[PDB]
Amino acid sequence: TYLSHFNPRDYLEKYYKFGSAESQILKHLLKNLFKIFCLDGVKGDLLIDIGSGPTIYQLLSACESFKEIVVTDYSDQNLQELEKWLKKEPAAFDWSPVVTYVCDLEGNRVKGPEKEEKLRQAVKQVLKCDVTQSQPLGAVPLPPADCVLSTLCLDAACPDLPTYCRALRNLGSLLKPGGFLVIMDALKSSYYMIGEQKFSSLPLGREAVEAAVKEAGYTIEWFEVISQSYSSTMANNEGLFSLVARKL
């Protein structure tokens, strides 16, 4: 059903079982998250994960580099699903094959159970976010953070370049001067809206994304294209990218 895309658990079961084109794209994301947090020096005390949705794959390597992680989403349902796993409930999603993959990428310094435990311990707060708001976390009493991570969670809320830029500028209020912004996102994306019977598209390319980051008050440390074009019946892009930036 297309309605499955409105259900956080159906979404997990459709794509993340890791047992496919999507699995190969996920390995590209995981290799680059490991590179960012564990080879390229993005480390510190406090990391805020924006638009976490119901997934934890984006935090597995990050929890080696940050003592505290705040996860957030605009949807209560996403966060309910995520909390099933954080609280170790039996009906939670089985992330074990993914966790095992990341432990192997990290050279098996930790085994899966110890990695899951380190992540659950690091997650200190589960909060609503809204990148469209000048105070995206609603002014919760968090001190300025060392990193904000935004993985594949902006295009639904930011339908065009100016709104994308403004969301990045709003996220900057969460970071200390010099604090890292890590974006992962899709170049020239489109997603088929079954209800409205049209694609909705966000034309991100390197030059436009770099400009949006720099006008949102960051300096770019590194941009990289990390996968080739992908096409399913319901989405397209011309590859995924990651970008590491520092707040002014």
Partner: peptide, 11 residues
């Protein structure tokens, strides 16, 4: 929503 891969979450 809709969460259609590679979309992961809702900022």
């Amino acid at each position: 929503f809709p969460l259609i891969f590679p979309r992961k979450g809702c900022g």
